[PDB]
Amino acid sequence: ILHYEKLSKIGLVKGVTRKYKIKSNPLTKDIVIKMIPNVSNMSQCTGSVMENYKTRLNGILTPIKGALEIYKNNTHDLGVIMAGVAIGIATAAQITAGVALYEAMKNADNINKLKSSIESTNEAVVKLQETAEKTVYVLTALQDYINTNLVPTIDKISCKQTELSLDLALSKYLSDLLFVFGPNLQDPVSNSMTIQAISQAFGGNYETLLRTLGYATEDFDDLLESDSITGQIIYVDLSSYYIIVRVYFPILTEIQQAYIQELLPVSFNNDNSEWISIVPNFILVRNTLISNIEIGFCLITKRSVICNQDYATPMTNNMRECLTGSTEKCPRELVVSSHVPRFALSNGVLFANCISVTCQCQTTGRAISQSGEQTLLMIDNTTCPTAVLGNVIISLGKYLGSVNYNSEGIAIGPPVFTDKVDISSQISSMNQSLQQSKDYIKE
Amino acid sequence: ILHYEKLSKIGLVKGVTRKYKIKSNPLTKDIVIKMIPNVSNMSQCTGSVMENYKTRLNGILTPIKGALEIYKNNTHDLGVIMAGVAIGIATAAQITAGVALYEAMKNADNINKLKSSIESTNEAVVKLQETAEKTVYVLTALQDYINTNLVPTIDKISCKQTELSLDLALSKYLSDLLFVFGPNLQDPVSNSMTIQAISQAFGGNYETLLRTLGYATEDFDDLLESDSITGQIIYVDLSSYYIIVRVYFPILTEIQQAYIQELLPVSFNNDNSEWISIVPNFILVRNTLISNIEIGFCLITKRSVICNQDYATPMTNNMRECLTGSTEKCPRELVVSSHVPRFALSNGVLFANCISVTCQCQTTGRAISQSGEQTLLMIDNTTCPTAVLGNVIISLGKYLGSVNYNSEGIAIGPPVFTDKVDISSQISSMNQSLQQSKDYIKE
Amino acid sequence: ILHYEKLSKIGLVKGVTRKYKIKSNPLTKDIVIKMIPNVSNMSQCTGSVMENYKTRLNGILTPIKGALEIYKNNTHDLGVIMAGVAIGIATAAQITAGVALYEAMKNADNINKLKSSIESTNEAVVKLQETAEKTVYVLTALQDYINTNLVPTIDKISCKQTELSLDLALSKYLSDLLFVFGPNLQDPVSNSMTIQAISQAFGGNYETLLRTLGYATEDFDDLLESDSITGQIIYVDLSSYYIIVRVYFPILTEIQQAYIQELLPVSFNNDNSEWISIVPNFILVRNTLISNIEIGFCLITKRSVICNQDYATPMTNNMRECLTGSTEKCPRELVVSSHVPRFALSNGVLFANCISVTCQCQTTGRAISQSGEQTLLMIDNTTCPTAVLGNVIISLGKYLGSVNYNSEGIAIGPPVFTDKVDISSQISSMNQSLQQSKDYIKE
Amino acid sequence: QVQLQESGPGLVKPSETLSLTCTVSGASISSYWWGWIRQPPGKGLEWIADIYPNSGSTNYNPSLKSRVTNSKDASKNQFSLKLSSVTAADTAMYYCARAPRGYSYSYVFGHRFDVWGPGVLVTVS
Amino acid sequence: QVQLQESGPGLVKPSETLSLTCTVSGASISSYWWGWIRQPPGKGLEWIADIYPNSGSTNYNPSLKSRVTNSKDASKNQFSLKLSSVTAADTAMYYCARAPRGYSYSYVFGHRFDVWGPGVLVTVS
Amino acid sequence: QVQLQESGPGLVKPSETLSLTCTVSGASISSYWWGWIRQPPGKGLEWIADIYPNSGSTNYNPSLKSRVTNSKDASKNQFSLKLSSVTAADTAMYYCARAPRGYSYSYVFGHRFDVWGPGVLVTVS
Amino acid sequence: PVLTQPPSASEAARKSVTISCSGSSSNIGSNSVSWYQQLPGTALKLLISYNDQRASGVSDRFSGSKSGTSASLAISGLQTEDEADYYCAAWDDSLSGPVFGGGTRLTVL
Amino acid sequence: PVLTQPPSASEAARKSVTISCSGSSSNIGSNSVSWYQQLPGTALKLLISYNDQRASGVSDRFSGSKSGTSASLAISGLQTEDEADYYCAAWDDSLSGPVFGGGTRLTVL
Amino acid sequence: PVLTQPPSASEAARKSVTISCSGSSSNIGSNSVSWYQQLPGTALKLLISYNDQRASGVSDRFSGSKSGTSASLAISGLQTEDEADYYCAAWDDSLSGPVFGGGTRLTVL
Ligand SMILES: *[C@@H]1O[C@H](CO)[C@@H](O)[C@H](O)[C@H]1NC(C)=O
């Protein structure tokens, strides 16, 4: 579908082909995060630290509960109906997340039956198991620091020093928490927040949180790094200071008739100057339809591209024509830097700009020369079994394309400038030229 | 001022309206940060750690003092005058910051009268109060770790182990500090650095630093997250290794006749394809004047937009005409992804592209159909008291606009492509067409 | 080469001139990082923590070794030759890094002769010195925490508590490690990863790592902050769980006939409105050739610009003409915000928009007035020895340019709009105008 | 409102032991610090001891440390003090008080007796 | 496969000391926890003690703590138990076992005797 | 420049106690480690003890630990050593020295006697 | 201290039976339960650990569960080879060691 | 150990008076000062804590200050109901407890 | 405990000589070596520390090295003023102090 032979002559060498995968079909599991430690074993050295901490934390947590109440108070069974008049203004994603919240409320009630047990936990990780329905894990922030450092040093340091250490630890925890759970969290009714961000309520240790789930999959790291494991806040307690979070754990599904092709850029020679083609380096093909892709939001692995949603974007007709063989429509830009690549290897064949770099044939010792009418040279073992470029010596294979590659020639597109200020300059100059042409007709 | 009814037909649904707030009128307060801990209670276990640490820290701190001296040596009372010849080259902001720096030196001298007391502090947070004018807080880095962890374990571990632990802690502190206080800080004569960044000298615990100030305000979190609380370095001591920092604490003032309007984008149907309008989603209206806003630098809350400065930017005449009702000038882009939103809710009324998603009337059970000539459908309770979209069931209100919304029709603007490479492709193609038209006249 | 006098009249005031420096000629040194701590002094309280940790870490480390094996198995002496057919597809940088890896394997073998000694280290930093060739430093993650916190508290807390603390510490370490060493690292055969990123395997303490090298240089901080100190993974052990890293330590070389000029933007008056010129603020001049520079990737100091590679980029002919004195080709944009600078100081001379700001002469007390035909005013001591602008009082020098600066006048370029949506709007409108002009000819 | 009541013997013979009891109403003794103070007739105040019953912590005045013992009873919400080997110098008015201590919002450390009992007079004859 | 063998005296006179030895094949005693259990004829199991030879750690049943001593020998890979002042209540079958304990992958804490020896009968007469 | 001077008795009777004093000029004894060394006539050096006066820390040679006491005097900037129950084996030349120890810039740990006194001869007859 | 088990249990073949084990907050409430089997005249073996995890080579007819301070062992498809004694054990935080139940003898009809 | 107060103070009505309290580095230099009032034949009550913070229901005519190792209590708008004894106290780090002043009796003319 | 040195060494003028010092894992294997010189009838002085670092005002003809549990001191350009005794010392982790060698006497021909 792409014309690789013509593309290689303007410095776009064929790269690795990859699969396309997207997340789907999540499983759900609920967990409790308690945001205040249990200080019952150091109660004589607490002062008024916990009161001030509770005041600050309540100030942080009140708006989140307020935002959840908007959907909680306006949703009822019919199979669930929302009161659109009361909600007023909302995106589709927010409404869907509200439906999910209403679904989670039942297990939330079951968990909240364990309030007294939740308040009395004294270890960093605890599994509460009373009945088959009343079972949940509890993770407590800063409990490990209190149990390991402060309690063992009682009476080895003064009570004043212990109190100051506890206060400083709590203040640092709040300083770290504010970025994720502060006013930046305008929309808690959603399921797009990653588990890594949520784990800041537990000091950023998401490995332990995921271990409590008990799942097992070969795509675990790929799911994590593609930002595909998310969580949603379902309940906030303003008297015990804990939250309930529902975690969504999906699978990765491969799009059947789709692939993503990479292109490696190489500089080429034209009119005693060095140039590079301005063409996207990643192209998505789905059912023989060509498009761009916003690959900066995806995860690129050796064999596939993994994304949490479909990031396809449209492409102009001229660019699509350029990719299919019409090289006079592919733009180019001048090279004024020494860092631009000058050669590449594809399927055992070398594509090199031997005007800009020295190319030698190790088998015979003779130099490899490029004429002024050639953009770049294809080197395989029909002409040179082993090539030398600087300090690099490479043994080569055989080219599967045309046997007359180096004698054909190609048509060259127009130059462009991609700097941001240069874009405005070019737009203004084109508009002025258009105005001149328009006023020439009137006179 | 904006034509909401016409805009909704090209998928721009009216969203929340917000107020505009900017920081102003700051109060000032000075504080000392000591960047070397007091090791007098473990002096037998120090080796040569402190000497090497002091060498490294002096290397870090010398350029900052050098930069401050340029303004300190060239400013005198007149009501203060700067020697422009000696300064040479400066921006207006730098000169204003230099004036502020000269103002702070009167209190800097009084603080520096407490040098011996500052050097002898042995706790993480200390308040020195000798006279009404000689009063200041001192915050000491790493003192808590030394007092809580290293001193209590003396003789439980070897002296060599204690020394190594101290060295590693100091090295980690420097590794974290270099990002903020290293060569990236070439302009210390300014008041634009946030208090969060400055708190890196105290391990990143800005909550304690702000608690020492003793202020109280309901807009505290909004001030913090809008990057409106800043600080300025006023004095550096290269023998005792401490700095004096002046903190600026402003209020938030609302701009009276201004507001910010949000637009929610929804895909619409035209010519058997799906489209999205390319229009800014946040519009600033001030005194009945329309402009863009660089909202990425501001903080968006439920009720207002909060910024540390005025971020208004100009808008083209064609775009302003598009926003006021001339929909033939609003550009559009093709949709090739499944993630684009398909419906939205505004003031209890549904705006939905029912060609792309299934729409049903729960009250009667009959389907809701959209013709090819319609871009999207408005659904209220005059025709559908309760609507079903997938797994979403919503009860609706009454539309306050025209009663003939679904039978009028609108004019559609031209398609565009927004990809970065496609921009250069389009510019080059337009220039080639212009050249062809120009050369047609000559012949 | 630049026309500073004409540029200053459209608000582009001459700033500081800086040197251009690029890294080159690196020295190499190898170091071992062990990613599992020695728990032999607390072996009774380990449970099954180490087995689970080893399973997770092996899962992380296997792909890196797999990627290295591709080059290791296909490179042999000739003076080294790569098997291009076996490699298949590769960029030039990857092949060069493979050559470097083959060169490093020789010292890797000598280091691996010390496997038993490496496994038995029990301190955070250890220097192994067996022979002149078998000498290396070993850095062990989390060993300091175990030695200082967990071992001294044995039997002061329960064995269960100690085990849980160890497990949590290991899990936090993995949570931090995954960002750098996870699936995001698909190309370990390279030498572009910074030492700061590599230090995450040692808790992010790159200061200690660099201290073990023993180097000394005055450009140390500049080398660090310009991301010029890099490292490469040479060997991975999947049974002892350590890696060998080669560090590259370069020098900075100054490009001889090159410099970088900065321009300070100031608003100016035209047609009862305030404007700002759209021109790049940093310009690179090499051998009297003018170009742009991608300065966002470089480090800007007081006296020089420091980069890890050449970041020069081309510039349009019209912009180059604007910089050389053709001011009718310099675009401009309207000002609708109060934050734009209104004056600047260059070589002791003031350039100020005194229509927008109040300018007074302190020597005589009389106001300084600007007419509607003047873009801005140059103020030196020929007309006002001491100037007052708001709360700023400045003593001024003498202007070295034309004595008739304020009575000449300049030609003004066309207006532009730089907002991202406005770019597409302008492109579409220009294309529509071009289509209208084209169809006028046919009819 | 928290209230405290002291109780003890009106007269104590020399060289015997004085026992006092403080009864609290409106709060639990196991959630606060408490303290004992005494005032001789016509003279100033003197601190005796501070106690935290929940963990059994105690701080003593060094002059009186060797003659002081403390005890508690959570069921009746009471705490008791005992001073042995009393002489004529030990006749005074005795008070129990609630004694919070710690850092303020702005990191200033302080101690205070914020609630006082009426006090009981003890005469050594 | 790890295997264990108990050894001891068939008959122990009253008020004397009983000595038992466990020999391990297939593993080193210095890398695991071990434990001792006994069962009287016709009755249930009773835990005696757990040991970690590498660090010399020991946990005791509080009822039998005062009469129990332990020892080891790494060269022959054996560990030994001694119970003093035996009465008629100490006749039983005795077992040694491997006794791992810790947190699981999902942070559930547990203890288990995963390998048992055949056991040796001791009669006190 | 730091300078040190030893002082002591020329002759010590057997079974008595030998006392030595080191006086420092040019530095404060409370900011450094110090040490004592001795050399028998015609033989090699032998370490006695190291001291840190500011915290009163001391490290001993295990052979001589039971017979060594140390003391200090900050006003006159002196530190003193005492060896009890002396025999004929204790006749030697005695030195005091400054004894810094720690990690270098490149994390190599070391110890060194960087400044030595002239020494004093002690004969046990 | 000790765990409470029923002395006896009985059920016919091809049926299912359940054995209970009761404890307290210090041992079963906070920690997991292990189950051991003792056949007539042979070595004891570990059946269940961590409240539900079967050992290697243990038939799927054995299952375990825990709720509150109690635990249960369920045996389905009852056969004659299942006649034995069954013991429960749990780690106790106040002892730093295991506590055993009294044992239950299973008789099949 | 002990804080130094003046035994007596006196001032006429509608005037203002100041009472000083002197200490050392271990108690007043490093910690705050509390002020208590004792009226004739009634229970003692807390007036000031943390060197300047008034208790609930305490008139604004009472103020406190601290400088160095000294502290001061100022009373303005002096009235007849202000006749009492006044005591200062401060936490001492070497005692882990409070140290009291000698007390000052206030007489109004 | 103790470090092993050769009792004597000898070499002619303008030549070079090497002195060895042998130890164990607790002292030389894990820590560095210091070298001291004792001239006839004069105060001892520090020559080398940290295995290779010369003291101030020490000639470049002295060098030091360490390998395994052994260390060496090399003297080049041998002269008559170099006749002395030489001692090696190393910190020992089991003693928290230095251990000395027996000393080597250097005679020049
Ligand atoms: C300009 O308009 C023509 C006519 O519709 C169209 O074919 C062409 O693609 C447009 N180009 C751009 C850059 O808008």
Please describe the structure with a list of short key phrases separated by commas or semicolons.
heterononamer, A: 443 residues, alpha+beta, 11-stranded mixed sheet, 13 helices, 23 strands, 32% helix, 27% strand, elongated, D: 125 residues, mainly beta, 7-stranded mixed sheet, 4-stranded antiparallel sheet, 0% helix, 51% strand, globular, binds 2-acetamido-2-deoxy-beta-D-glucopyranose, viral envelope protein (chains A, B, C), signal (chains A, B, C), host cell membrane (chains A, B, C), glycoprotein (chains A, B, C)
Textual characterization of the structure:
The PDB classes it as viral protein/immune system. The entry lists the keywords Henipavirus, Fusion glycoprotein, Antibody, antiviral protein, viral protein, VIRAL PROTEIN-IMMUNE SYSTEM complex. The assembly is nonameric. The complex is a heterononamer, with three copies of chain A (443 residues), three copies of chain D (125 residues) and three copies of chain G (109 residues). Chain A is α+β, with helices and mostly antiparallel strands and 443 residues long. Chain A is 32% helix and 27% strand. Chain A contains 13 helices and 23 strands. In chain A, a hairpin with a 2-residue loop joins β2 (75-77) and β3. In chain A, α2 runs parallel beside α7. The longest helix of chain A has 24 residues, at 49-72. Chain A is elongated and about 85 Å long. The two termini of chain A are 50 Å apart. By secondary structure, chain D is mainly β. Chain D has no helices and 13 strands. Chain D has strands spanning 3-7, 11-12, 18-25, 34-39, 46-52, 57-60, 68-73, 78-83, 92-98, 101-103, 109-111, 115-116, 120-124. In chain D, the strands form three sheets. In chain D, strands 2, 4, 5, 6, 9, 12 and 13 form a seven-stranded mixed sheet that branches. Helices cover 0% and strands 48% of the residues of chain G. Chain G has strands spanning 8-11, 17-22, 33-38, 45-49, 53-54, 62-67, 70-75, 85-92, 97-100, 104-108. In chain G, strands 1, 3, 4, 5, 8, 9 and 10 form a seven-stranded mixed sheet that branches. Chain G has a three-stranded antiparallel sheet with strand order 2-7-6, with no helix packed on it. In chain G, a hairpin with a 6-residue loop joins β3 and β4. Classes of the chains: A alpha+beta (443), D mainly beta (125), G mainly beta (109). Chains A and B meet through α2, β3, α3, β4 and α4 of A and β1, α6, α9, α10 and β15 of B. β23 (392-395) of chain A pairs parallel with β3 of chain C. Bound molecules: 2-acetamido-2-deoxy-beta-D-glucopyranose. 2-acetamido-2-deoxy-beta-D-glucopyranose sits between chains B (426, 429-430) and C (428, 431, 435).
